């Protein structure tokens, strides 16, 4: 397939070829043009707070070691020995000043340097150039309010610019709330879906909630529960959708601070969020303080998603075109009482974890939609994302980005897939920029 010419996503992101969910050659091409190029979620400060603390993380199909340095910074390295390529670290988290390879015993520092080689003097003499044998380092590692992302491409925009117009929406909860903590360890489950299936669902799919999650809405007694079985449409002004230049996007459901949490947490949460909102009015204004306590379903392009307020935090780790390893963490606000944090974390896993009853509702939808992308008669068929097209705006006086001023639509699918196609057809960041110089105009046509 010629990725320079092949129209995988139509103009304005209105449709995508179904093969994108099934084609293994395209998956291999995404490793290069999506995963090796873009910002990928690694960890949070709260999981590696002290010098020597480390975790392992996936970046695409690669595995990295992410380590807190003595100077307080974080560096990340390929989990691969520079000698004969054995996996260095076999655990998920810990604290160490270095990592020793179990094959021939080479010792690397937490800073990635090759520090020791068994019997170096007797064997290599002075001929081994250890300075050139440090672990392969992730070129870019940056933080968004404690959330640590990595990028293999030195040419990428800074993480903040990469978030584009999505940053404005995330800031009230990520920054102005006093800060979030990631509660680990994550749940980890393999699903037989393409990573784009859950990524697109979290970025902009409010339409599915009433129908897909009918049973969870009815059974769990949560705040969005009036929607079970499409019994009721969210009223006008119930929310909005947004998307951005580099692909990130989200839905906003006004005031839904208790999110998917069952009735057992609703009063406590609605009290807590409301109290902080009243304080934030004076600091960031009424609109932004309201966004703080509003439910955001967001994907940070390409494969990191979240539900704020619900506190669900997801990584869709790619394995192959029909296989994804799902990592699920909980996010909590630092200044919540510890007992509330504990119950919120359990509730995140109860609803969206390995045995998350809400998440289970999505299984067949994402797996079959992905697997159908391999089927002969469906490869060249068009997946539709045209809902709300012709009603999006850009440059609004209050809400930034390409914005659909309605709770339910496909605005964020369009921006997600516009960025995806621009990356797939580009050889580097400069080409992506050239392919994106009229990004918002393309999204707001008609």
């Amino acid at each position: 397939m010629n990725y320079n010419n092949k129209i995988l996503v139509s103009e304005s992101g209105l449709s995508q070829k179904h093969l994108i969910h099934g084609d293994e050659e395209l998956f291999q091409h995404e490793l290069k043009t999506i995963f090796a190029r873009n910002w990928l979620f690694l960890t949070h400060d709260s999981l590696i707070p002290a010098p020597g603390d480390y975790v392992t993380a996936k970046m695409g199909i690669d595995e990295v070691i992410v380590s807190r340095q003595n100077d307080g910074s974080i560096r990340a390295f390929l989990n691969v020995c520079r000698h004969r390529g054995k996996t260095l670290v076999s655990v998920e988290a810990g604290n160490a000043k270095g990592f020793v390879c179990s094959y021939h015993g080479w010792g690397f520092g937490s800073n990635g340097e090759l520090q020791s080689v068994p019997f170096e003097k007797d064997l290599y003499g002075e001929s081994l150039n250890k300075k050139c044998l440090g672990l392969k380092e992730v070129a870019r590692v940056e933080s968004f309010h404690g959330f640590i992302y990595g990028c293999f491409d030195q040419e990428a925009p800074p993480l903040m610019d990469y978030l584009g117009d999505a940053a404005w929406y995330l800031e009230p909860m990520f920054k102005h709330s006093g800060g979030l903590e990631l509660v680990g360890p994550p749940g980890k489950v393999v699903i037989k879906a393409n990573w784009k299936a859950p990524a697109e669902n979290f970025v902009g799919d409010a339409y599915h909630v009433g129908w897909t999650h009918a049973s969870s809405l009815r059974s769990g007694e949560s705040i969005f529960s009036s929607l079970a079985g499409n019994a009721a449409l969210p009223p006008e002004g119930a929310g909005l959708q947004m998307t951005s230049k580099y692909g990130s996007g989200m839905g906003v459901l006004w005031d839904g601070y208790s999110g998917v949490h069952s009735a057992d947490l609703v009063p406590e949460l609605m009290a807590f969020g409301g109290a902080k909102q009243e304080r934030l009015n004076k600091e960031i204004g009424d609109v932004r303080a309201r966004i703080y306590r509003s439910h955001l379903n967001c994907t940070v392009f390409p494969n990191n998603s979240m539900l704020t307020c619900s506190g669900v935090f997801k990584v869709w780790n790619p394995i192959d075109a029909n296989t994804t390893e799902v990592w699920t963490y909980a996010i909590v606000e630092k200044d919540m009482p510890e007992d509330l944090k504990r119950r919120l974390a359990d509730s995140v896993q109860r609803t969206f974890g390995p045995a998350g009853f809400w998440e289970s509702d999505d299984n067949d939808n994402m797996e079959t939609a992905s697997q159908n992308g391999k089927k002969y008669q469906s490869r060249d068929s068009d997946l539709l994302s045209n809902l709300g097209f012709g009603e999006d705006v850009y440059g609004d006086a209050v809400y930034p980005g390409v914005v659909g001023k309605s709770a339910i639509g496909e605005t964020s699918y369009r921006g997600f897939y516009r960025a995806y196609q621009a990356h797939v057809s580009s050889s580097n960041w400069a080409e992506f920029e050239h392919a994106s110089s009229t990004w918002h105009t393309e999204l707001t046509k008609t």
Binding site: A93, G94, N95, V183, V189, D346, Q349, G353, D361, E367
Partner: protein, 192 residues
């Protein structure tokens, strides 16, 4: 067990062994086997309401954890060691049961098929609470659906059971430390 000598054994595991090596009561092992076999039967036929009514105590904690992989020599990193795949009280189990029975649970059509294999049953009365029964057992749980989806779960269960309404022994705690870190079964949406 001396865990200083048996270096791979956890304090928790050594404690659990001790409770079964002491007073062996054959009749109790048999009662426990019946209790668990009947529980598994109700679950296998998806009689989830009957399971709640007949097998689950009002004060239940139903817990399945997933433990982060850490170095055997690790002694400094002290953050949350595990997450809860399940950590349910009775009302939370009821929510899950209602979710299973809801006619708009699309994933349950066509009907799922469950087959449970319960083995290695051990039973011992608690030392301090002579009405608390400790039961250990292992389960293989086979779930088949949608023509060619087959998921097999494997686990050891540490239970406490206690006589409740009508003198019927019911589950007051189940603890499972799930042995596979990354699930290869699509989800863990089964009652172990």
């Amino acid at each position: 067990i001396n865990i200083q000598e048996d270096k791979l054994v956890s304090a928790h595991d050594a404690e659990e062994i001790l409770r079964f090596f002491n007073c062996h009561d054959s009749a109790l092992q048999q009662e426990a086997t019946t209790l668990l076999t009947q529980e598994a039967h109700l679950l296998d036929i998806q009689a989830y309401r009957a399971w709640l009514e007949h097998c689950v105590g009002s004060e239940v904690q139903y817990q399945v954890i997933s433990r982060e992989l850490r170095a055997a020599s690790e002694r400094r990193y002290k953050l949350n060691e595990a997450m809860n795949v399940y950590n349910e009280n009775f009302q939370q189990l009821k929510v899950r049961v209602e979710h299973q029975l809801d006619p708009q649970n699309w994933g349950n059509s066509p009907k799922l098929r469950f087959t449970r294999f319960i083995t290695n049953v051990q039973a011992a009365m608690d030392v301090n609470d002579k009405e608390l029964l400790h039961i250990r057992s292992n389960v293989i749980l086979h779930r088949a659906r949608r023509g060619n989806q087959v998921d097999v779960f494997y686990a050891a269960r540490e239970d406490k059971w206690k006589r409740g309404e009508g003198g019927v022994r019911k589950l007051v705690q189940r603890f499972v430390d799930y042995p596979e870190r990354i699930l290869q079964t699509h989800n863990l949406m089964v009652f172990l």
